[PDB]
Amino acid sequence: QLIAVDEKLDITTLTGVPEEHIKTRKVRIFVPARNNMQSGVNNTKKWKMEFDTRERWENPLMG
Amino acid sequence: ELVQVLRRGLQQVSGHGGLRGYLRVLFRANDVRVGTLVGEDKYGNKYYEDNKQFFGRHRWVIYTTEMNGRDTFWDVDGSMVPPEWHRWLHCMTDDPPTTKPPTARKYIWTNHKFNVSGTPQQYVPYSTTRKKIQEWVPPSTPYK
Amino acid sequence: GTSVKPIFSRDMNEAKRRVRELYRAWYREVPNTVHLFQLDISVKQGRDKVREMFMKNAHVTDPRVVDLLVIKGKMELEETINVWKQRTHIMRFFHETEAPRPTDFLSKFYVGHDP
Amino acid sequence: GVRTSPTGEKVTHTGQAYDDGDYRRVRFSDRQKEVNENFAIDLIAEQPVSEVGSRVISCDGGGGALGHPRVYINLDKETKTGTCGYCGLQFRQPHH
Amino acid sequence: LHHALIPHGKGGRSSVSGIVATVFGATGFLGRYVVNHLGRMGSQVIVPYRCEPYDTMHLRPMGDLGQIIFMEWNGKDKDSIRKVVEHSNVVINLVGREWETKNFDFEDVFVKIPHAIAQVSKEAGVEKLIHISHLNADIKSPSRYLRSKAVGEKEVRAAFPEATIIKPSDIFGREDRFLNYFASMRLGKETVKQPVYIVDVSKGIINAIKDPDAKGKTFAFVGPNRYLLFDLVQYIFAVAYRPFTTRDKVERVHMSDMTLPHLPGLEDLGIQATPLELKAIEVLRRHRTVKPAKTVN
Amino acid sequence: TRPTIRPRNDVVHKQLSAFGQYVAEILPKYVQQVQVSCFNELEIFIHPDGVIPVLTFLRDHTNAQFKSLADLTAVDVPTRQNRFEIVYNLLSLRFNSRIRVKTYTDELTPIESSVTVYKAANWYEREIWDMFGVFFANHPDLRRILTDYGFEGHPFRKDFPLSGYVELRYDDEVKRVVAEPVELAQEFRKFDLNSPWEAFPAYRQPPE
Amino acid sequence: SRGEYVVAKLDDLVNWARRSSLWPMTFGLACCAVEMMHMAAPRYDMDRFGVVFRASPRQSDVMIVAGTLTNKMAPALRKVYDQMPEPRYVVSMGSCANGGGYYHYSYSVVRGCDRIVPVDIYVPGCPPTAEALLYGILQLQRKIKREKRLRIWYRR
Amino acid sequence: TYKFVNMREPSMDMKSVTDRAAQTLLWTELVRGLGMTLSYLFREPATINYPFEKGPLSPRFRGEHALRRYPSGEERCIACKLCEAVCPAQAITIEAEPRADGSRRTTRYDIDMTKCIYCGFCQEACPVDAIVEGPNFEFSTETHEELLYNKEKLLNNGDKWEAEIAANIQADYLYR
Numbered sequence A: 001q002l003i004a005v006d007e008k009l010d011i012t013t014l015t016g017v018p019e020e021h022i023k024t025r026k027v028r029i030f031v032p033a034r035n036n037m038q039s040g041v042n043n044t045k046k047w048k049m050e051f052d053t054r055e056r057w058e059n060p061l062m063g
Numbered sequence B: 001e002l003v004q005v006l007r008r009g010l011q012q013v014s015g016h017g018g019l020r021g022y023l024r025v026l027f028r029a030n031d032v033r034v035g036t037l038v039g040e041d042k043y044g045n046k047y048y049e050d051n052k053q054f055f056g057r058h059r060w061v062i063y064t065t066e067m068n069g070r071d072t073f074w075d076v077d078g079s080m081v082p083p084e085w086h087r088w089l090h091c092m093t094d095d096p097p098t099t100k101p102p103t104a105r106k107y108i109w110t111n112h113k114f115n116v117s118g119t120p121q122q123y124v125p126y127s128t129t130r131k132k133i134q135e136w137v138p139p140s141t142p143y144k
Numbered sequence C: 001g002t003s004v005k006p007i008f009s010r011d012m013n014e015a016k017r018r019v020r021e022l023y024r025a026w027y028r029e030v031p032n033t034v035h036l037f038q039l040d041i042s043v044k045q046g047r048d049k050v051r052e053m054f055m056k057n058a059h060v061t062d063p064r065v066v067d068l069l070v071i072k073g074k075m076e077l078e079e080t081i082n083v084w085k086q087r088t089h090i091m092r093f094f095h096e097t098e099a100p101r102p103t104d105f106l107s108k109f110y111v112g113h114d115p
Numbered sequence D: 001g002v003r004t005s006p007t008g009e010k011v012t013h014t015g016q017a018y019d020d021g022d023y024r025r026v027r028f029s030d031r032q033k034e035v036n037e038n039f040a041i042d043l044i045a046e047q048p049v050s051e052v053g054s055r056v057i058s059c060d061g062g063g064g065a066l067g068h069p070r071v072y073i074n075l076d077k078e079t080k081t082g083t084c085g086y087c088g089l090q091f092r093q094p095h096h
Numbered sequence E: 001l002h003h004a005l006i007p008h009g010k011g012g013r014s015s016v017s018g019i020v021a022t023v024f025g026a027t028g029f030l031g032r033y034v035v036n037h038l039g040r041m042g043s044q045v046i047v048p049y050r051c052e053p054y055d056t057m058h059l060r061p062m063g064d065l066g067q068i069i070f071m072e073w074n075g076k077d078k079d080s081i082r083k084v085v086e087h088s089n090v091v092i093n094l095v096g097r098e099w100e101t102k103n104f105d106f107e108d109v110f111v112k113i114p115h116a117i118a119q120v121s122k123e124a125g126v127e128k129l130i131h132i133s134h135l136n137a138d139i140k141s142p143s144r145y146l147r148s149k150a151v152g153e154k155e156v157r158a159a160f161p162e163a164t165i166i167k168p169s170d171i172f173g174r175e176d177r178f179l180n181y182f183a184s185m186r187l188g189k190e191t192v193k194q195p196v197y198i199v200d201v202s203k204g205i206i207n208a209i210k211d212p213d214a215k216g217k218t219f220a221f222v223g224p225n226r227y228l229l230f231d232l233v234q235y236i237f238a239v240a241y242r243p244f245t246t247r248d249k250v251e252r253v254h255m256s257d258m259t260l261p262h263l264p265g266l267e268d269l270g271i272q273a274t275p276l277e278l279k280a281i282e283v284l285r286r287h288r289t290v291k292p293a294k295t296v297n
Numbered sequence F: 001t002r003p004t005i006r007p008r009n010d011v012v013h014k015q016l017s018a019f020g021q022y023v024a025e026i027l028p029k030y031v032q033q034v035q036v037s038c039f040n041e042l043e044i045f046i047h048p049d050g051v052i053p054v055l056t057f058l059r060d061h062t063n064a065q066f067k068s069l070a071d072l073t074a075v076d077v078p079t080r081q082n083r084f085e086i087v088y089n090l091l092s093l094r095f096n097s098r099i100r101v102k103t104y105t106d107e108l109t110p111i112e113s114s115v116t117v118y119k120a121a122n123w124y125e126r127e128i129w130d131m132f133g134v135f136f137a138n139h140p141d142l143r144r145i146l147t148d149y150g151f152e153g154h155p156f157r158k159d160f161p162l163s164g165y166v167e168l169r170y171d172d173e174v175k176r177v178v179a180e181p182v183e184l185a186q187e188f189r190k191f192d193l194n195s196p197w198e199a200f201p202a203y204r205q206p207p208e
Numbered sequence G: 001s002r003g004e005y006v007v008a009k010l011d012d013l014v015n016w017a018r019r020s021s022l023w024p025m026t027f028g029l030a031c032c033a034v035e036m037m038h039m040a041a042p043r044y045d046m047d048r049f050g051v052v053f054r055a056s057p058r059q060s061d062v063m064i065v066a067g068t069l070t071n072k073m074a075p076a077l078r079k080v081y082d083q084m085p086e087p088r089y090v091v092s093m094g095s096c097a098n099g100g101g102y103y104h105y106s107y108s109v110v111r112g113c114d115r116i117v118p119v120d121i122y123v124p125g126c127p128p129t130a131e132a133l134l135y136g137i138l139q140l141q142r143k144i145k146r147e148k149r150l151r152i153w154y155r156r
Numbered sequence H: 001t002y003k004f005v006n007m008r009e010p011s012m013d014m015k016s017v018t019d020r021a022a023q024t025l026l027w028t029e030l031v032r033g034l035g036m037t038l039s040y041l042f043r044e045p046a047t048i049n050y051p052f053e054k055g056p057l058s059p060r061f062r063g064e065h066a067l068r069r070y071p072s073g074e075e076r077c078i079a080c081k082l083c084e085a086v087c088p089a090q091a092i093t094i095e096a097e098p099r100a101d102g103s104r105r106t107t108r109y110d111i112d113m114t115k116c117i118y119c120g121f122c123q124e125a126c127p128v129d130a131i132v133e134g135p136n137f138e139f140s141t142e143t144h145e146e147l148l149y150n151k152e153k154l155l156n157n158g159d160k161w162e163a164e165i166a167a168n169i170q171a172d173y174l175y176r
Ligand SMILES: CCCCCCCCCCCCCCCCC[C@@H](O)O[C@H](CO[C@H](O)CCCCCCCCCCCCCCC)COP(=O)(O)OCC[N+](C)(C)C
Pocket: B027, B028, B029, B030, B074, B075, B076, G009, G010, G012, G013, G016, G020
């Protein structure tokens, strides 16, 4: 009633992400630093995972 | 009865300045009603009211035949009404701009404009900011 | 250990059996799909596209992921058989209007900052 | 003060004008460029400086609840005037 | 390179490719494909139109917001051509009429207009000019079309020495006048044709725009297979399931396509020409209600 | 507690607590936790294997007979090992009451479909499969219900981008509607709104 | 000369005929359809302008896109537009149809109906009032009146 | 308390059966509907004569946007970016910098009218009454690009509609 299969979990084929947004992106796992403009620490309690910055350009119309 | 309504129709014909005015108003506005003149506009529009008509038909405007640059005997639109008569006509207020006029400012347009889409004076958007990064300019002198 | 609840298949053998069944059905359906939607592709290249889609997931070594893929492919087949899709949905597999992307390092260096 | 760029384009109140080599000027061909003729900086420079006999003066932009939030301006620096951070109006003590 | 003209993005609808193009005659059969291929990668396109703007509607969804600008022009005024190509670094000349009108003969359309366009572009500082001629264009042709095309090509080369002359060979496509004209019938065995795909010609024009070394060169866009006219016509009826332009066009279509191995072709632009057999069904499916024709090489 | 504060009803709180203890006693094989909120809402967190039994009890027991399925949805919490939580909201007209049942699952573990207990569940389950990828075993026909045909991915997952991966337009060269990688004329502006200086001391977590 | 006078008067007659009877088929996708039905209501009475109510796709002059166009719906709208005879015009009503509007940054919404079909008139608002849509229809009528086809044919 | 809508029982005596048969064979209720439609024909229609007549509006009506200025002629906007932060549709884009005289003014202020949902949140988040939603609603356009407003267009709108906008604000500011 249980397979008891022993393998590293990988659902990368079931989420529908394009292939070049999986093997090319580099995620950062970190606790965000406290904003030095303020003395509060409530924004440094959890962990954040984010993606690497890619190119941003200027729209020819309206800039 | 019938006689009274035909007499009222005859008075409607008479009150538009004769047969020529009757035909002009009938072919320009598809309406031949007569009401008390409330206001005259600096562009030529005329504004009439009739409080015995039901709400929405108690106020109307006969548009001018010539706005800023175009003939307007046939091609009329609602964007021609100046803002004060726009307020009075849409029943946002009970007072025409004649009894009490709007406050006068030095930046308010003295010349209203209609919708200028489809015309050379239409609006074209652009980015109103300056260039963020400036490039290096090489010297004009030779290096060797 | 890592005991897990099965979806459809107990091990990889039943998973491969289901994969073969699905491939059989898709290969059989291809020419009828080509004729019915009046596609400009041939039956040969449609079956090649089916083979390529099946090959895209060839590295999976998990029965649960495999039969989830089989279920999704079966739903896609049900969509394409009942003509719930249109020609656009079928032709979306071929990326005809996309510019070819060069994997060469020099080409990628010249075009922009994308690695 | 509406000015005109050497290429002919009107310079906006933000100082924006496409340079001579800019292709984007093609968008204004057979059409016009929208520029506001009233430059607020000049209009606020044309206002007189009001003299008040107090060290601190309050400004709400005029109109009460129809202006900006009420702020208090100090007038102890005799070298320059006190300017409202919202409206731009200038205030001064009666020097001499 | 004028920073605003630096490519940015991933070559998509909302990207910048640094190409400002003035496509004369963009309302025709090849103009729509050229404008589509230009706008797919985000280039700014200027469309000069003489017709009613209703006929230019189909070009509006071909680009992002503000990337396609329509301006009016006429072929006999130099100021219109001036204001249309003033800010463009690429000019494409697709102006051409298959017949004569009371206001334009072949002289006006194929000689005077291309020469004026090339001269105005050269004066204005346009970097690239792409002029379209015919494969069979020579001075000693019996047809006025080809003589005018050849004289216009020489005049364009004189006025704009760095122009790229592209000589397609009887373009066929969905809105073409070759497959449709032959299928609209409802002499042979001596005429041979070299039809070329419309998308192939569009890709060739775009690649020539992007090609740095193809500045003053001359290309010839031809199909892979040479077809005799009779055999080719038979295939058209067969695909369409049908049982088997005053004087100039019949003479032109009875002429055989030349062969210029000295001229570079579509391969040198990295394009593999597609056979007519594949796209014949696509074009001629609308004419309805498998044994490809034999070729000679 | 002056007029700006919501009034409290302790009678309903006591009734819901009593019924929660009652349900927990009757079905200890599946119930893992019972909670009542400060606004008198009763929720029961159960083991995934007890979807069909517990629901049936709540549908059929004389003292519960929760005969209406108001809603069935899922919540995505990536930080948990069991990523998805399934929520059943039930209404009983005889007792004028409402109950909530919670279950957990992950990507590769199928929940047993509850169409037999409630037919109304059917479409709801499809939606979950369309939005979170939760497979429901023994569903009469499990397929996408809201997304486009051929759409890849599940959009209501927390790791799905807001604007998706592809966008549609019309291409004249191929004379049809095509899908291309998504590019935005203006990128969505991400705002950092969360402020320091915690607001509610009652929810402060231990510093571990 | 008389040759251009004849085509000018023929243009005037044909333009008057085309703009004086506009038969719209409306894509009632979302809430802007409600304002369309209010423009068809007794107060505004689109029919009094010659603009009939709910024409058939095979006999419609103008297409009114009133609502959000989703990715699942774009092929159907394009097919219906292609089935329409010429001359044909498209009016984009509301923010959702103009540029996506409130759902612009969505995975299942087409960012503007002009990615699919060319648009003649853009009616702004969320939703535009019935008076606003009537103003857009009259502006389309003026645009039709401005056009000139026999003249273009004659001078070409 | 509940009501029964369809819980009536027809009487089975001869007179009522004859009445029902007469209704069936003579179509009485059909003539009743005909008569009601006929009566509706002989009353005044509710149609107004647009564009010469306009529908009623109110000072609170939200139409086209505008940027206002102080009576001295100085723009009210101080680049606080509250309207941009509150905008549900992300339709407002603002860039600012110190002016030549050190004033806090915007250098870029765009509103995408094809993104705007016309909720009026921007004009109620503004603390200086700079951005308002005017009463103009007849601003349909033939191209998409002209619905992408910038600072010049909005300032022109304010200068164009200031009289009516100020009158509406005077009429309705005591309810805010
Ligand atoms: C007998 C043989 C028959 C053969 C076919 C002939 C077709 C029938 C002929 C009858 C044609 C009827 C024409 C009547 C149109 C007049 C409408 C007039 O009022 O239009 C105004 C004038 O506009 C134009 O100037 C009118 C152009 C009409 C045609 C011009 C002359 C064409 C005559 C040529 C006939 C010869 C035909 C030969 C080939 C068949 C503008 O009004 P409009 O903008 O709408 O609406 C504005 C709404 N407002 C006023 C309430 C605000």
